[PDB]
Amino acid sequence: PVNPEKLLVITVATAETEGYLRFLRSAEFFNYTVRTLGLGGGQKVRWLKKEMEKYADREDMIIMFVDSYDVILAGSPTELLKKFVQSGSRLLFSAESFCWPEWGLAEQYPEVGTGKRFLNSGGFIGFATTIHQIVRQWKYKDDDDDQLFYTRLYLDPGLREKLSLNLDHKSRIFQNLNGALDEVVLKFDRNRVRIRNVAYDTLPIVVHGNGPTKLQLNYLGNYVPNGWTPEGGCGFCNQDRRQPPPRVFLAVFVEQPTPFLPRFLQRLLLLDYPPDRVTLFLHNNEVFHEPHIADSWPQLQDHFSAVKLVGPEEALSPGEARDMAMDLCRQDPECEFYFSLDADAVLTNLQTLRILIEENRKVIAPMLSRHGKLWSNFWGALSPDEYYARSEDYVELVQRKRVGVWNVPYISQAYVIRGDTLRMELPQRDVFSGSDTDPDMAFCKSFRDKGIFLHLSNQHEFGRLLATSRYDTEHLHPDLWQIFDNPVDWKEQYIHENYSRALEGEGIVEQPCPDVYWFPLLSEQMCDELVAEMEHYGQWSDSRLAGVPTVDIHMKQVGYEDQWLQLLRTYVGPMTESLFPGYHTKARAVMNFVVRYRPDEQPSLRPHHDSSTFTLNVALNHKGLDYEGGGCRFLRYDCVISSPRKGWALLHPGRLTHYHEGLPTTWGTRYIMVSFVDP
C-alpha cells in the first residue's frame, strides 16, 4: 500500500485562470499536494526537468504530471495510487485516440485491442526516478513540441522495456475527452460526482478536456467532483461569497420594438441598489420607443447618478452600441461592475444586481426564461457550427430541478461583468463587432477565447423574457394586443390589480342587485387605452329584445374580437363559474362592443333583454369626472346601480328576469364595454 504523502502532483500554469483554480479546488477536495510550476509546450518540460533534479533519487516518490487549465480531478490519491500499482508500470502515460503531431508514428505503436493506442503528454504518473530519467533528456527549446519528445522516447522499444513505460489504454486513471465524448458519462453519488467510461467500465481519476472538448469539460466541471451534488446542492455556489456597494454602469439596449417598454423603464427605478452608485446608459434603436423613453427620461435622470441616451439618430448597430456601452465602463476606472440588460428582460427579483455581484464571478447572468417554455437567455451546448444545441442537463436547469451557478457556453439579455476583467483581460473594443457573426455570439466567443467562464445562476428566481417576435406596432396602443404573446405581463398591466383576490374570495365581489354581481376586472390603463382605441377608430354606430340600438363600436370592426374573447375565456369565465355555482362556460360571445352615451347623441337605452345567458357590463370611465348621469336599472327589482366603478364589471342574467334600462347620461361622455355571453 503506497503512502499518499509520497505522491506529488506537478502542473504548469502561468496565470491563475478560472480553469486553473477549478483544477486546484478539485485537487484540494481530495487532499492532494499540488506543485505548480511557472506562476511567476516545450517550456513545460524545461520547468519539469529542472524541478525533477531535486527528486532524481527519490524512488520512494510517485509523481503525477497533468495540465491544469483543462483538467479536473475525479478520484482520491489512495484510489489513484492503487490503480497505478495495479498497472504494474513505472511511468504510465495517458492514452488517446489520435497520434499527434506525427501521424506516421502510428505504426511503431504496439497493437492495442479495444483500448486507446497513442500517447498523450497532458497526463502521466510514475516513480520520481523513472520520470527524472525521461525528462532529464530534454535539451530543446520552449516552442518545440513536448508531445513528440515524450512520444519519441516511448516508441524506443528498448527504453520502453528498460524503464517499464506504459499507456493507460482503457482510461483507468486518465480520461482524455477528445475522440471519446461518447464514452464518458457522469456517475452520481450523494455528495460527490465523478465520471464513468462506459466503453471500458472504469472510473478515471483525471479528466482532461484536451483538444476541442473544453466546453464538455466545463459541463463535467459543473458537477465533478463537488460541483453540484444531489444532496448538498452545488458546492461552489455557497463558498464564493454566495459599507457602500460597488459603482455600476447599467447599460440598457432597445434593439427591436419591445412590448411593455414603459413598464421596463419604470422598473429601472425600482431595482434594489443605491441609485447614486449606478450610471445609466440606454441605447434605443427604435423610433417607436422614442416617446416611451422621452416620457421616462426625467425620472431616470433624477434617479441615477448619471444618465446617457443614444438614440436612433446615431444609427448604431446593436454590436456597435454594445461595444460602446461596455467600453464606457472599461475606460472608467471607477466602473467596478458592468450590468447589461436588454429591453425584453423582465426582472421580477429587484435584488438581482446585488445577488449577481455577491456571487463574485468575472461574468455571470441570471437565468431568465420565456414564461412556461424552455427557451432561456443561455445555451447549455453548441453545435460544431456554433448553432444552438440542447445539452444533457439543459431542461433540468431551465426547470430548476438542479439549481446553482453553471459554467455555460452562451449567455444573453442580462449579465454582470467585472470591470477589471474588461480592462485587464478583454481590453479590445471589438467585443461584439468586427465580424459577420452575430453580436451576441461574438461576445460569448470573445470571453471563451480568453478562457473566461460565462456563469449562469438559477439559484434564485430572477425574472422572465418577453416575446418580441412578431410584435405588431400598427396600433394606437399595441400592448393591448399582447394578451396571447405575453399574458403574464398583459395581466399585470391590463387586468385589475384586485381581480385575483376577488376571484379567490375575500369579499371583494358585491351583489348590488339580486343576481347582479359586481367585481373588478380591468385596470384604469386598460379602460383608457380601450376607449382611446375606440375613438381613434371613430366610426360609431344589436341583439336586444324589447316588446333596440346603441351608438357603439364592435370589437370585430377594430380587430380586437379574438383578443377580447381571450380575456373572456381567461378571466370572466372563471369568475362566472365561481359566482353561479353549477354553471359552466366556454365564454362564447358574438356581441362584444363598446357603447358611448352622450346627451348630444344617444344618452339612454330603453328597457330590454339581452340576447345572452349572461351579460358582462364593464364601465370604462369615471362617473362625475367624465360623465354625469345614471347607470343601469333592473326594473323587476326596483334596483339601480347609480354609481358605477370605472374598472368594475356587472354580471347579470340576460333573459327572462333582468329587464334592464340604461339611465340617461346627462353630461360628458359615458363609455361601457358589454358582451352578450353564451347566446
Add this chain to the structure above:
Amino acid sequence: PVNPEKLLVITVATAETEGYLRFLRSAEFFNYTVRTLGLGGGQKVRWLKKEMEKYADREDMIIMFVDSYDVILAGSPTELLKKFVQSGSRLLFSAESFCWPEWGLAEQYPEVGTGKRFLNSGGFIGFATTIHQIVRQWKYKDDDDDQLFYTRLYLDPGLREKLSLNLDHKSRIFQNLNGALDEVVLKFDRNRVRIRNVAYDTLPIVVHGNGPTKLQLNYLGNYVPNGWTPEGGCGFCNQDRRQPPPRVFLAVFVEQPTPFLPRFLQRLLLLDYPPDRVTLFLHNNEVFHEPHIADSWPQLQDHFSAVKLVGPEEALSPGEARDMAMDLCRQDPECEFYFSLDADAVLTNLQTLRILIEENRKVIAPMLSRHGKLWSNFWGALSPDEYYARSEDYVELVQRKRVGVWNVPYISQAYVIRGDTLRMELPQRDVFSGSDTDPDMAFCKSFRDKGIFLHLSNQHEFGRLLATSRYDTEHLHPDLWQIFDNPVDWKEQYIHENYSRALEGEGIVEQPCPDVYWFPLLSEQMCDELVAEMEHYGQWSDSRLAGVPTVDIHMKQVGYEDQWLQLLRTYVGPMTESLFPGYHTKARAVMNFVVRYRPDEQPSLRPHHDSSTFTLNVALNHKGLDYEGGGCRFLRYDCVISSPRKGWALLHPGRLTHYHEGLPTTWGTRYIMVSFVDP
C-alpha cells in the same frame, strides 16, 4: 175623408190558431174593428154572403175582407181608407202574379203594364153595397173554389164596369207574397215596422203570405207591425207573461258519443226547478256512456220525482226514442210541459226551464250556439229542399243584436212543449219517425204542418252547444283531448278553478323562492286523469346540464304533445308574461314529460340546470297521501319547496341561476309534470 168608424174588417177562422191570433194583434195595434166569421173555400163566401145581408144598403160602410191565418196588417185604417179612395174603385181586389185556378182565363184579364195582373180573393176592400151585390150571387157549395167565383165575376166586362171593380195591381194596399218575394223588404221606424214593395215603391197595408210563403210571413211577422222595434225591443216578448209550478217531463237524449257527459249529468241536478215536479226520461244510444250514466243514476233517482233509463240494449233509433219520450208526456194528463234536452246542449242559465215556461208558448227553444261561431240550435230559413239556408236576420239573432222571441222554421237540441198541444194538436205518435227524413226535421215539419209556431228565445243568455263531430273515444279519458274542440268546457273541467283569479292578480300567486313563482294551474281531475293516462301507457323510462335522466314519459309518446302545447300557449304563456314583466313567449317546448319518483326505482334528481329559458313544474298528486318526500331545492338560494300543492305549478328560470335538485321521495309515488319552455 172617410170615417174609420165606417170601416169593418171581416175575416174567417174556425179556430184561434197562433196565426189567427197574430193577425188579430196586428189589427188591434191599429185599432181596427174585426168581425170574425166561423169561430164556432166556398164556405167562406157562404158565411160572408150571409153576413152581408145586414149591410146590403150600407153605402156609408167600407168593408175589407181578408184571410186571417196567413195575414198581418201593416198600416192604419186612416191610411187604408185614404188609399182606397185614391184608387177610385168601389170594390178593390188584391192582385198577384199567377192566374189560378183556371190558367186559361189569363187572356180575358185586362193588360197591365208593370203591375200584377190577376185577382186574389184572399183580400179585397169595397163599399158594403157593392160587396153585397157580388157575394149575394154565390149559390154553390162549400168545397167549390171561391177564387174562381170572384174571378169569373171580375172578368165579366159589363159587370166590372157597372160596379167599378178593380185590382190593386201595384200593391198599394194588399201585398200578396207568392211570386213577389224579391219585391218585399222590411221598412223600420222607431216603434213600428212595416214593409215596402221596392218594385212599385209602395207601403202596403195587408201582408198576405199566400201559397208557399208561410215562412216568409212568419219572418215578417216577427217585426210587423210591433213585433220587434229598434227602440222598444220586441213587443210580444213582454206582453205574453215574459204556488207550485207545473209538472214537467224532462227527456234527455244521448244519441252520439258526447264530450263532458258526466258534467251534463251533474248539471241536471243543478237546474233551478223543483225536482219533485220533474220526471226524468233518459235515452242513451252509446255503450261508451253507460258507465257515465250508471255513475250518475243514484243521484238522479234521489233527485227527481221519477226516473227512467232506456239503454243501448233496446236498439231504439233516435226518432223512435224521441217519439217514445214525447208520447210518455202526451199520454200522461199530469205532464203539463215536455222539456227535451240533448246531451250536447250546455245550459249555463239554470233558470232556463222557468224562463221558457213563463213565455207561455206552445213550442219554444232557448237559443244555443257553438261558442264563438254562428252555428246554433235553430235555422232562420229553409231551402226549397228543406236544407239549411241563412235568413236575412240570422246573424243579428245569433249575435244578439236583436233579442226577443222569434217565429222560426227549425229548432233543435232543447225545447219546451206544452203537453196539451201534444194531446190536442199533435196526437200522433210518429212525430220524429215514419219517413226517411231526418228525425229532427220531421219533428219541425210535424208542427209546421199543423200551423204550430216554433219559437226561439234569445232574450237571455241560455248556454251553448258542444262540438261532438269527431270526438275521439280511443282514450282512457277522452275529454283530456278536448282542448281544441270545446275549450270553454275543457277549461272549466281541467284548468284550476282559481287560475283566472291568479292570472288577474288578487294575491294568489306566491314567490316561495327568489324568481320561483307558484300558481294554481290544473284541477285535481286534470291531475288524476293525466297520471292515470300515463300509467295506462305504462312504458316508463333528457335536456339537463350538470357539470341527468329521469324515469319519465313524454307527451309525444302518448299522443298528447299538441294538446299540452295548446295549454302552454293559452294558460302558461300569459301567466309568465304577467309574472316576468318585459318577457314575451310563444310557449315553445320540445321537452314535455311526466316524471315518476319512487323509492323502488328513481327517488331523486341530482342538481342540474334545465335546457330552457324557464321551466314549468306542476305537481300532480298529494304530498302525504300519495307520497312522502321532499320537492325541489334551489341550491344557490338555500330555498326548498318542501310542501308542493297538487294542482299548482312552479315557474323558475332554467339556466345559469337556478341550479336545482329533486329531493328524494321516501314513500309512495310522486308524479310531476315538467316542460322546458323556450329552449
